[PDB]
Amino acid sequence: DFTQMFYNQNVKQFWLPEEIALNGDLLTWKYLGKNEQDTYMKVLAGLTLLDTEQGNTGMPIVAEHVDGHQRKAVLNFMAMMENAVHAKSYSNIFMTLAPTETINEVFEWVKQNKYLQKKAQMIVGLYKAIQKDDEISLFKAMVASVYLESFLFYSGFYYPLYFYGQGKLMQSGEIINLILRDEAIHGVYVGLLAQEIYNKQTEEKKAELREFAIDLLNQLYENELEYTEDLYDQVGLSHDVKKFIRYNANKALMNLGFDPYFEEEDINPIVLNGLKATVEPLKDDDFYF
């Protein structure tokens, strides 16, 4: 009911890194404090590292196990955006703002970081556990994918959106907004594929899959809180970032056809400023009464 519509929306959102000139960001970058520059670098590396997993494994593995030519095509398109567009865009932002040696060090740090690694490996673990012709294991991986696309990225997206909403780092913020817009539709689409599997299950199996999804969300959420304090306490933003994580967790759940887990909260206004039943023929005798 939905793949051709998503095909259309995906291909019409096509873009390339070269379209946004990045050099003019240096005019606001130079005015940020060390803690602001440090947080930005670390957040950016976090997003880059997670998105690489999605391009190399997450999208291609789901495309491999999903049946249907049109679904495979949409999924291929999404994998292309991760590897050919998003990855180049993150690299471009880095090369503009930091010298080569600084980039290498930030990636070394974030690569060793406990909270980034915990979430990255949790997601990758579920992708590696998909078994041929087993729709339960596929569903679990889709849940992981939706959580990455619609939830885990957002502790990171917060900061570029925060600057973007203030008139700072506008070129890289525009790029991030385009990336985020792609991840949103990726999350919604994979969510619909997961609901299709979920709806084929018994009531007991459904309850079991719900427990899986909520348990996974809880593990990731508790690590996100730690990740958040680790990065954002030094710039005083953690309270507001936490509200943004919960709001996006609720969107991820709704993508999977589940109820929101967290109470509704208002979001930081600066970040906000940045942001067929069944055809049946008439067989005669229906005109007579």
């Binding site: 039943a277 069944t278 055809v279 049946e280 023929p281 008439l282 067989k283 229906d286 005109f287 009464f289």
Partner: peptide, 20 residues
């Protein structure tokens, strides 16, 4: 006021009975 289970034929039947 239709149910989700109602088909196109059922809606057409309702319309034709209304016309009748």
């Amino acid at each position: 006021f239709l149910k989700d289970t109602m088909t196109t034929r059922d809606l057409n039947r309702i319309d034709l009975y209304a016309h009748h």
